[PDB]
Ligand binder design. Structure first.
Ligand code: BOG
Ligand code: BOG
Lengths: 149, 48
């Protein structure tokens, strides 16, 4: 999946792995980490979520209490919109015949959270579904691709 | 000796134009398909 991203969005931010590079891990600084937290972990970009037997009012109260720091400027309350990532029809083939089985991942560009089409797409995926050798349904599964498989 | 003389040349003319047009288009098509290989890049990444 990292390779899928690395090529689908080559030359952009989405092309990077979450764990980062070997070089970065070897040289990141106490500074950089601090800088990351300061730059990114900010109130307008965060959400306190709770589920279970808790009182909203009780919850919001505690928040105000330990989630202090208020902002002065207008830049501190601005949620930055990221530079769009360009999709590219391409391929990356990492070959090693010494590996037991092959992995293949193919994909087209999706719409993004907001779009209502995402609902349909998920319904679509529901038709093709998924499968693995321990599905008891076997040759009777409703998924045509699972059946042939 | 050759009554077809004129028709033969009128055809030769059409043959040339179509020939030029087609050879061109097919050249693009060929290049377009091969582009995948012509620009392809590769690397050797041993576990070295
Ligand atoms: C039908 O076609 C005609 O046939 C003639 C000969 O039969 C040629 O001389 C003409 O140029 C051609 O248009
Ligand atoms: C590379 C393939 C080229 C094919 C070119 C086809 C053109 C031939 O076209 C011919 O022209 C003659 C003269 O007008 C006509 O009399 C014939 O009926 C017509 O078939």
């Amino acid at each position: 999946f990292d390779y899928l991203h690395a090529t689908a969005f080559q030359g952009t931010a989405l092309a990077r792995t979450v764990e980062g590079t070997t070089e970065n891990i070897k040289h990141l600084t106490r500074a950089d980490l601090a800088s990351y937290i300061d730059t990114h972990f900010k109130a307008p970009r965060m959400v306190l979520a709770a589920a279970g037997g808790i009182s909203h009012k009780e919850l919001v109260d505690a928040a105000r209490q330990h989630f202090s720091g208020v902002s002065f400027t207008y830049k501190e309350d601005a949620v930055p919109i990221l530079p769009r990532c360009r999709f590219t029809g391409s391929e990356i083939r990492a070959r090693d015949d010494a590996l037991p089985v092959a992995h293949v991942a193919l994909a087209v560009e999706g719409p993004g959270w907001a779009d209502p089409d995402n609902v349909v797409l998920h319904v679509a995926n529901a038709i093709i579904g998924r499968y693995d050798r321990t599905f008891g349904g076997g040759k009777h599964l409703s998924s045509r691709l699972a059946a042939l498989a | 000796a050759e009554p077809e003389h004129d028709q033969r040349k009128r055809m030769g003319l059409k043959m040339l134009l179509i020939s030029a047009l087609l050879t061109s288009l097919l050249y693009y098509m060929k290049r377009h398909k091969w582009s995948v290989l012509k620009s392809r890049k590769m690397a050797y990444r041993p576990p070295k």
